[PDB]
Amino acid sequence: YQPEAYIPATDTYIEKDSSINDEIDKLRHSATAALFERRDVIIVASVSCIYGLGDPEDYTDLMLSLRPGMIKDRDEIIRKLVDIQYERNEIDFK
DNA sequence: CATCGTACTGTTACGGCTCCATCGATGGAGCCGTAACAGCGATG
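Output (structure tokens, whole complex):
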């Protein structure tokens, strides 16, 4: 990670560059889901636990509920899935 | 010295697409030259 910064002494600006690790992201998402799923969860974290995450109210209110017999268009459900940052990929299924 | 931050920019291999340069011969018919073949009369 190289956060953007500006140095007035040299009048030079550095652009932001980052790389994402898949395993750590999956572990973080699993921890976040387990927090809302079960109460008997133990989380081992670094000082990263004090950095800005999303709103828990938005996380709870944006859960999609589906049951048999409920009328709903397939396109509407696909749009709802896309709106919660789900990527459609028939080749790379992860 | 380790820790943290809401999917980052620039330059190279490699496969697929497209444009451009560069590169007589054989059989049939007619002709010439050469060889080959066919085709009144008088007397005893």
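Residues 31 and 43 of chain A are 7 Å apart (CA to CA).
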